UniProtKB/TrEMBL annotation:
Pfam families (UniProt xref): Lectin_C (PF00059)
Keyword Signal: yes
Protein name as catalogued: Type II antifreeze protein
All residue ranges annotated as the C-type lectin domain in the record: 9-124
Originating species: Hypomesus nipponensis
Disulphide bond pairs: C2-C13, C30-C123, C67-C98, C87-C109, C99-C115
Single GO MF descriptor: metal ion binding
Amino acid sequence: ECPTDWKLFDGTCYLFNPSVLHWADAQESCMKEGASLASIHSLEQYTFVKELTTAALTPSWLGGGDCQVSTRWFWMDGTSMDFTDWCYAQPDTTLTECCIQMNVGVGKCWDDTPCTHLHSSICAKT
Ligand SMILES: [Ca+2]
């Protein structure tokens, strides 16, 4: 039920893009194949997504941030910010590091990151 290479979890198709890109390049790459950088809304979705990110659980971009107004988090896929997994000392909430990166540090958790940093990414389409 997903296109070749994409992986199904509860009605949504996901793809890991290993190419290291800034957040906007990563979003554009998802969009070229009809997708967005992913959102996360449950523990099971989160585990499924982590399992796409190589054995290394590579630090990766998600489709979230607070880049318009600090502390106001939004996803790119029309869903709301509900579930989060902030690392200790996150989020900073500063506009200079406003894009959400997952798989950060030993704890494999979220950190609001300068959007120009280069990371792999997770795309999703439903
Ligand atoms: Ca941060």
